[PDB]
Amino acid sequence: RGRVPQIQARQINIFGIVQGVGFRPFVFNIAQKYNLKGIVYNNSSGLYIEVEGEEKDIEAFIREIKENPPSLSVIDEIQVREVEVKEYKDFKIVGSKEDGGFVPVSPDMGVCEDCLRELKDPKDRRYRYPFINCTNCGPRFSIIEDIPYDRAKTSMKVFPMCEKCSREYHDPHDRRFHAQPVACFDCGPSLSFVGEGCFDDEIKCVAKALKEGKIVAIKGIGGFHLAVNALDDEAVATLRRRKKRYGKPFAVMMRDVEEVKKYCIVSPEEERLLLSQRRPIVLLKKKGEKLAKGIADDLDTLGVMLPYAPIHYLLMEEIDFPIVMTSGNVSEEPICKDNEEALEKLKDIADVFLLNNRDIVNRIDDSVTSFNAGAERIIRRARGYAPQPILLKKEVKASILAVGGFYKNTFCMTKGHYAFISHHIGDLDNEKAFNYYIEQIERYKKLFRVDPEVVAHDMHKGYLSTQYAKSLDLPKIEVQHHHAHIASCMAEHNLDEKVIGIAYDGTGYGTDGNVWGAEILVCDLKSFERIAHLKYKPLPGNELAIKKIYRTALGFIFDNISFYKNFVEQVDSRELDIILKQIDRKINTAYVSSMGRFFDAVAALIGVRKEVLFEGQAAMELESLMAESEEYYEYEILKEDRYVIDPELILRQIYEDYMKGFEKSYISAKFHNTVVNFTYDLANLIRKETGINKVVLSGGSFQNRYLLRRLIEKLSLSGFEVYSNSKVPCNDGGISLGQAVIANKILEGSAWS
Numbered sequence: 001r002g003r004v005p006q007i008q009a010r011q012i013n014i015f016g017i018v019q020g021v022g023f024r025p026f027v028f029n030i031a032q033k034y035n036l037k038g039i040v041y042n043n044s045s046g047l048y049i050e051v052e053g054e055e056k057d058i059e060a061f062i063r064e065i066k067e068n069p070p071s072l073s074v075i076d077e078i079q080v081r082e083v084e085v086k087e088y089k090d091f092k093i094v095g096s097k098e099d100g101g102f103v104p105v106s107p108d109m110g111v112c113e114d115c116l117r118e119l120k121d122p123k124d125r126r127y128r129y130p131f132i133n134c135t136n137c138g139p140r141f142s143i144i145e146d147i148p149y150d151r152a153k154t155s156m157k158v159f160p161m162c163e164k165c166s167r168e169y170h171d172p173h174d175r176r177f178h179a180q181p182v183a184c185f186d187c188g189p190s191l192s193f194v195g196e197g198c199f200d201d202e203i204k205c206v207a208k209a210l211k212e213g214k215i216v217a218i219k220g221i222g223g224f225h226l227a228v229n230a231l232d233d234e235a236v237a238t239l240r241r242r243k244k245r246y247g248k249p250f251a252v253m254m255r256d257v258e259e260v261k262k263y264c265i266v267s268p269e270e271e272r273l274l275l276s277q278r279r280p281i282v283l284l285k286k287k288g289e290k291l292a293k294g295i296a297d298d299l300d301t302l303g304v305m306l307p308y309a310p311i312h313y314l315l316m317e318e319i320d321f322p323i324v325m326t327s328g329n330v331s332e333e334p335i336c337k338d339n340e341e342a343l344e345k346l347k348d349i350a351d352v353f354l355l356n357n358r359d360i361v362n363r364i365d366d367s368v369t370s371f372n373a374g375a376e377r378i379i380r381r382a383r384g385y386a387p388q389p390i391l392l393k394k395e396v397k398a399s400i401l402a403v404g405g406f407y408k409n410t411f412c413m414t415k416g417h418y419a420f421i422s423h424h425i426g427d428l429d430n431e432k433a434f435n436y437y438i439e440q441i442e443r444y445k446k447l448f449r450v451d452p453e454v455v456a457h458d459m460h461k462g463y464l465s466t467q468y469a470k471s472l473d474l475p476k477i478e479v480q481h482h483h484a485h486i487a488s489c490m491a492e493h494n495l496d497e498k499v500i501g502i503a504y505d506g507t508g509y510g511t512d513g514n515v516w517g518a519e520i521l522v523c524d525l526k527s528f529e530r531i532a533h534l535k536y537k538p539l540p541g542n543e544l545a546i547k548k549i550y551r552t553a554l555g556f557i558f559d560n561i562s563f564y565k566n567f568v569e570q571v572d573s574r575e576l577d578i579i580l581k582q583i584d585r586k587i588n589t590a591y592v593s594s595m596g597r598f599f600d601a602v603a604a605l606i607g608v609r610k611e612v613l614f615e616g617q618a619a620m621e622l623e624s625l626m627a628e629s630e631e632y633y634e635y636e637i638l639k640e641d642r643y644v645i646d647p648e649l650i651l652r653q654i655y656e657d658y659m660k661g662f663e664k665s666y667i668s669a670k671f672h673n674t675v676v677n678f679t680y681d682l683a684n685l686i687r688k689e690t691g692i693n694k695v696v697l698s699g700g701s702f703q704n705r706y707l708l709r710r711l712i713e714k715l716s717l718s719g720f721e722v723y724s725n726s727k728v729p730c731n732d733g734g735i736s737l738g739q740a741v742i743a744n745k746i747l748e749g750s751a752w753s
């Protein structure tokens with residue numbers, strides 16, 4: 001009697017990052033709330049739900065999912081179907097099913113506020129538990145072997161739950177209800193300290209070593225890192241000597257935003273990036289108090305991160321100083337991920353070790369990011385970001401592997417509407433880096449069920465990535481480097497039309513046998529036209545000039561030597577003769593149009609540096625010292641087949657300023673403004689010719705905050721719609737995404753079968 005129940009059934013599939021986020025317990029709880037019966041389980045394509053009940057209750061259930069999905073979920077699609085009623089008697093979370101699809105994998109996540117409260121609560125049984133996590137935080141990618149996500153397919157598979165954790169797991173009122181990684185002191189991983197004898201707890205042993213000025217190798221989420229007191233001058237010097245990493249700045253971990261603000265300017269948008277559970281290193285302008293010498297000498301920025309694992313919060317209560325965190329490897333080798341590996345490879349580097357017995361399946365570096373010109377500008381996309389895919393507007397024609405470049409390598413694999421760009425792999429410069437690259441390609445193919453049908457690669461035949469591409473038994477598409485930079489940005493912004501592409505970087509292989517890197521293109525995703533570039537200058541020695549930048553300067557001034565007397569006289573007389581003869585005789589000489597080399601020529605000419613320890617160092621120092629000015633240098637654009645600007649004419653005025661006694665800061669500002677001004681002028685010329693109003697800025701020179709912001713502002717004020725990289729780097733870390741979407745566009749055209 002009364003209202004007759006009307007029972008309906010719906011099948012619901014949810015796609016995206018929808019596993020390892022506590023979606024199963026969430027669904028269970030809202031299904032109970034709305035008196036629905038049925039089942040939920042992880043399948044190979046995401047999340048599968050069957051619910052039966054009143055239509056009104058099903059609708060409210062769906063609305064709850066849409067309105068407040070789990071915190072770590074990144075839902076891309078929800079499918080809802082009417083199905084027949086089975087007369088389920090209850091609602092249950094059931095076993096996972098492998099049905100042959102594929103599903104995205106969550107990045108590793110920083111400790112949530114609930115776990116942090118429990119960690120610091122002396123009455124909680126997880127008080128000071130170094131591996132505390134829950135459905136809303138902790139390692140994911142780093143410990144996942146396979147999908148559908150479940151404890152048995154993670155390195156927690158060798159840590160069976162104790163009776164207490166199992167009770168929590170099976171208790172619908174517990175916040176760890178069906179939490180796949182649930183563990184505790186009794187059943188979970190443990191720390192292991194190796195050094196000298198210490199009778200204190202492991203974290204305290206680490207704190208003491210750090211206070212004594214020693215180097216600690218710490219097993220973290222993505223691999224090992226080496227730490228020292230960032231206020232300790234000699235400790236930092238010792239770390240640099242032992243790692244053999246002498247120039248590149250060190251990132252530092254600080255306890256909280258309050259501490260960071262003592263050393264850095266922190267905007268609200270930068271504060272948001274720091275505090276994100278993604279927990280990257282964020283590049284921040286220095287202000288106020290100073291860290292030790294040898295952290296970031298001659299730069300105006302510091303790379304800062306906050307604690308991201310429970311061990312960091314524990315360590316922070318024991319020390320009163322920020323710490324260097326640099327990856328645990330000898331310079332130029334992949335980050336160590338295994339205990340045995342670390343103890344062997346870091347034996348002459350670290351003084352003591354903080355190990356643990358939770359296997360790292362997939363090693364991954366810290367991410368490096370920033371906020372500039374109204375958006376996040378990522379530099380190194382790794383822990384906390386990768387392996388989250390870039391969303392494509394349309395499903396792909398077929399799966400493509402894009403092999404990436406040489407510097408800062410990533411590869412990218414497409415499937416469905418995702419571009420799975422890999423985490424940062426590193427400079428593909430040696431056998432160890434290459435072996436690691438190769439293994440990551442195999443692991444991403446397995447993890448995401450990708451079987452590449454076509455391989456995309458750079459035109460540069462010397463990249464190990466290119467050699468790898470050619471080694472495969474697949475059709476190949478070659479992609480010009482600068483075209484790929486522009487396409488990487490187009491991909492993020494769903495652009496698929498001809499844009500004005502400003503591709504500024506150090507070196508990319510051009511189609512005319514020369515080095516490119518200061519190019520203006522008109523391109524879409526399937527072609528490019530080169531419209532403008534810098535007048536080619538000889539670069540004697542090729543790889544030698546990368547680090548001996550006075551050689552780059554000599555190349556830029558080769559045909560007007562007598563003008564730069566003071567500079568040329570500083571070069572050793574015999575070496576000078578040889579360099580000039582080599583240029584003249586075309587011995588080991590490349591011809592370059594390059595914003596990176598232009599920057600190096602300026603830095604050398606005004607005596608910033610004559611030699612550099614790492615690629616781009618001189619350009620970073622030049623940017624860091626710049627003054628506040630609107631002044632700039634005269635330039636000339638000559639139009640023949642293409643528009644060309646001669647950088648040497650600008651170098652003449654720079655050297656004139658230098659001889660007169662102008663401050664380096666002022667000269668740098670004038671130089672930066674000149675590049676902005678001529679680039680703007682070229683863009684306007686091109687718009688007048690073509691009607692094109694979209695401008696894309698990419699290539700590693702746009703890591704320069706000033707160039708990027710000023711050009712975006714100036715172009716925007718003149719009506720352009722301006723785009724630059726945000727989710728992937730404008731440096732070579734982003735190249736694989738551009739290669740992927742270019743090759744994909746070609747596949748769907750008439751010029752491919």
Ligand SMILES: Nc1ncnc2c1ncn2[C@@H]1O[C@H](COP(=O)(O)CP(=O)(O)OP(=O)(O)O)[C@@H](O)[C@H]1O
Binds near residue numbers: 281
């Ligand atoms: N102030 C700053 N500005 C720009 N980049 C910074 C920075 N501080 C740190 N970084 C970057 O953050 C990254 C930290 O990584 P590390 O592990 O310390 C060295 P790496 O580049 O991976 O090579 P290596 O491990 O082979 O020596 C480096 O690329 C470094 O240049």
Ligand SMILES: Nc1ncnc2c1ncn2[C@@H]1O[C@H](COP(=O)(O)CP(=O)(O)O)[C@@H](O)[C@H]1O
Binds near residue numbers: 703
């Ligand atoms: N702050 C900066 N200002 C100006 N140029 C920079 C800055 N940082 C890096 N660059 C330039 O960008 C280059 C890196 O460009 P990428 O596109 O990553 C590598 P490639 O030049 O091989 O294509 C560096 O070698 C340097 O020449």
Ligand SMILES: [Fe+3]
Binds near residue numbers: 485505508700732
């Ligand atoms: Fe590049």
Ligand SMILES: [Mg+2]
Binds near residue numbers: 326327328
């Ligand atoms: Mg490193």
Ligand SMILES: [Zn+2]
Binds near residue numbers: 111115116132135137
């Ligand atoms: Zn948590």
Ligand SMILES: [Zn+2]
Binds near residue numbers: 162165187
């Ligand atoms: Zn337990």
